[PDB]
Enzyme design. Structure first.
Site, PDB file in Angstrom:
ATOM      1  CG  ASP A  32      53.845 -41.236  15.772  1.00  0.00           C
ATOM      2  OD1 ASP A  32      52.778 -41.461  15.170  1.00  0.00           O
ATOM      3  OD2 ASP A  32      54.362 -40.097  15.839  1.00  0.00           O
ATOM      4  CG  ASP A 213      49.229 -40.682  13.004  1.00  0.00           C
ATOM      5  OD1 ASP A 213      50.053 -41.284  13.732  1.00  0.00           O
ATOM      6  OD2 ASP A 213      49.071 -39.444  13.046  1.00  0.00           O
TER       7      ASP A 213
HETATM    8  C1  LIG Z   1      48.360 -40.790  21.770  1.00  0.00           C
HETATM    9  C2  LIG Z   1      48.062 -39.359  22.235  1.00  0.00           C
HETATM   10  N1  LIG Z   1      46.910 -38.808  21.507  1.00  0.00           N
HETATM   11  C3  LIG Z   1      46.962 -37.967  20.400  1.00  0.00           C
HETATM   12  C4  LIG Z   1      48.173 -37.661  19.685  1.00  0.00           C
HETATM   13  C5  LIG Z   1      48.176 -36.778  18.543  1.00  0.00           C
HETATM   14  C6  LIG Z   1      49.431 -36.500  17.874  1.00  0.00           C
HETATM   15  O1  LIG Z   1      49.777 -35.364  17.526  1.00  0.00           O
HETATM   16  N2  LIG Z   1      50.230 -37.588  17.695  1.00  0.00           N
HETATM   17  C7  LIG Z   1      51.583 -37.528  17.094  1.00  0.00           C
HETATM   18  C8  LIG Z   1      52.522 -38.381  18.022  1.00  0.00           C
HETATM   19  C9  LIG Z   1      52.269 -38.128  19.510  1.00  0.00           C
HETATM   20  C10 LIG Z   1      52.002 -39.238  20.397  1.00  0.00           C
HETATM   21  C11 LIG Z   1      51.755 -39.019  21.802  1.00  0.00           C
HETATM   22  C12 LIG Z   1      51.769 -37.687  22.337  1.00  0.00           C
HETATM   23  C13 LIG Z   1      52.033 -36.575  21.466  1.00  0.00           C
HETATM   24  C14 LIG Z   1      52.281 -36.791  20.066  1.00  0.00           C
HETATM   25  C15 LIG Z   1      51.592 -38.005  15.618  1.00  0.00           C
HETATM   26  O2  LIG Z   1      52.908 -37.958  15.104  1.00  0.00           O
HETATM   27  C16 LIG Z   1      50.785 -37.081  14.732  1.00  0.00           C
HETATM   28  N3  LIG Z   1      50.777 -37.494  13.320  1.00  0.00           N
HETATM   29  C17 LIG Z   1      50.409 -36.366  12.423  1.00  0.00           C
HETATM   30  C18 LIG Z   1      48.868 -36.087  12.518  1.00  0.00           C
HETATM   31  C19 LIG Z   1      48.431 -34.889  11.566  1.00  0.00           C
HETATM   32  C20 LIG Z   1      49.659 -34.277  10.768  1.00  0.00           C
HETATM   33  C21 LIG Z   1      50.373 -35.468  10.005  1.00  0.00           C
HETATM   34  C22 LIG Z   1      50.797 -36.665  10.945  1.00  0.00           C
HETATM   35  C23 LIG Z   1      46.951 -36.186  18.105  1.00  0.00           C
HETATM   36  C24 LIG Z   1      45.718 -36.472  18.803  1.00  0.00           C
HETATM   37  N4  LIG Z   1      44.528 -35.889  18.383  1.00  0.00           N
HETATM   38  C25 LIG Z   1      44.410 -34.448  18.103  1.00  0.00           C
HETATM   39  C26 LIG Z   1      42.917 -34.198  17.992  1.00  0.00           C
HETATM   40  C27 LIG Z   1      42.276 -35.568  17.736  1.00  0.00           C
HETATM   41  C28 LIG Z   1      43.352 -36.552  18.185  1.00  0.00           C
HETATM   42  O3  LIG Z   1      43.139 -37.750  18.334  1.00  0.00           O
HETATM   43  C29 LIG Z   1      45.749 -37.369  19.953  1.00  0.00           C
END
Ligand SMILES: CCNc1cc(C(=O)N[C@@H](Cc2ccccc2)[C@H](O)CNC2CCCCC2)cc(N2CCCC2=O)c1
Length: 374
Positions: A32, A213
């Protein structure tokens, strides 16, 4: 030996094999670049086939402090500690690293994802509880001779630690500066759909930030940009009409197996700031990336997809569906992100995902939303 060390998919995440503890406990860990905490399931959970058992590790040290980490999707709480960590199909080294032992979670673990923990590869600035909790990659670099760089080829796929593997990309690597070391923040200077400029002040593209990301599935766009993008994609694909729910990512679109009309959907070009003043390059995204296949035997007479572009109130997120088909180099040492066309990019016999430049912009406006170094 580091090639093909990733498994998984955009929708559920890509993971790499790691071991924690003495003797080594093998766990699959989601990679991640959008967070900075290393955390592993450490108590039974319905979606976990295994978990970190601290009582089996003689090298575990409890830091006697809890931690809470919320993401866009999911959240967990756990106990902070340190232990020995290795990557069997990465550099053959062992480092002592901070680990959060997850004891409680909500909508974090994903059923059938085959991973049990998460490796936050971003910078200490965004670590929880605070930036004093050194992230894993920082510990790896400090304690070993590994170069301060890693690269991701998301397809399976490869995480290459400490290096760049030429067999994983074709053509040239183009670099965009890391604007600030917290997330892997970059600057988008221009967006085109079907070759047509969206014609916004470029700061809009980077409100509040733009990041690369690997832990987010979709390309997420600021509300204003998202709405403009949807209108342009709708117009390009207008020979077919879809319910508003599709565009909101709230329902699938399906076609008879093998008949997906790729040609009616436009290519999207994201222009990234170059390393030289007023230069840029573009990465181009095919519909095969932003229409995400949803596997389901029940629907399997058809090919069905979710629209994987969605709205954000926390800036642009270039998620897994964007990274797929590119080889992405996180060159921490030189504070830059490199993009090249991946060896495993999917496409058809008419169009191809691309990374190309240089392009020049006459407008000298800084496209960053915030004034740098303030
Ligand atoms: C792989 C699973 N799919 C996801 C995961 C995440 C998400 O929140 N990922 C986290 C890590 C994580 C990985 C697996 C499970 C939970 C968390 C990352 O740190 C965010 N990074 C952040 C993102 C924004 C704030 C700054 C960094 C958003 C998704 N979303 C949400 C709506 C559209 C979309 O694709 C779909």
């Amino acid at each position: 030996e580091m090639v093909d060390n990733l498994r998984g998919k955009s929708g559920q995440g890509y993971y790499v094999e790691m071991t924690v503890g003495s003797p080594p406990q093998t766990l699959n860990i989601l990679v991640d670049t959008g967070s900075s905490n290393f955390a592993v399931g450490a108590a039974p959970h319905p979606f976990l086939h295994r978990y970190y058992q601290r009582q089996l590790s003689s090298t575990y040290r409890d830091l006697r402090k809890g931690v809470y980490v919320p993401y866009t999707q999911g959240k967990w709480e756990g106990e902070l500690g340190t232990d020995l960590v290795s990557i069997p199909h990465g550099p053959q080294v062992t480092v002592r690293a901070n680990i959060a032992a997850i004891t409680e979670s909500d909508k974090f673990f994903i059923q059938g994802s085959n991973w049990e923990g998460i490796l936050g590869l971003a910078y200490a600035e965004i670590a929880r509880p605070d930036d004093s909790l050194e992230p894993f990659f920082d510990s790896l670099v400090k304690q070993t001779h590994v170069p301060n760089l890693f690269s991701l080829q998301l397809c399976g796929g490869s995480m290459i630690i400490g290096g760049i593997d030429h067999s994983l990309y074709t053509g040239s690597l183009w670099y965009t500066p890391i604007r600030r070391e917290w997330y892997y923040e970059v600057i988008i200077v221009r967006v085109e759909i079907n070759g047509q400029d969206l014609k916004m002040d470029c700061k809009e593209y980077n409100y509040d930030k733009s990041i690369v990301d690997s832990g987010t599935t979709n390309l997420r766009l600021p509300k204003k940009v998202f709405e403009a993008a949807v209108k342009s994609i709708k117009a390009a694909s207008s020979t077919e009409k879809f319910p508003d729910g599709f565009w909101l990512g709230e329902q699938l679109v399906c076609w008879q197996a093998g008949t997906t009309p790729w040609n009616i959907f436009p290519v999207i070009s994201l222009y990234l700031m170059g390393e030289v003043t007023q230069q840029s390059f573009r990465i181009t995204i095919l519909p095969q990336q932003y229409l995400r296949p949803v596997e389901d035997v029940a629907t399997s007479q058809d090919d069905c997809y979710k629209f994987a572009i969605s709205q954000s109130s926390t800036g642009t997120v270039m998620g897994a569906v964007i990274m797929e088909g590119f080889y992405v180099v996180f060159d921490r040492a030189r504070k830059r992100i490199g993009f090249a066309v991946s060896a495993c990019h999917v496409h058809d016999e008419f169009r191809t995902a691309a990374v190309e430049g240089p392009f020049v912009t006459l407008d000298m406006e800084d496209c960053g939303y915030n004034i740098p170094q303030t």
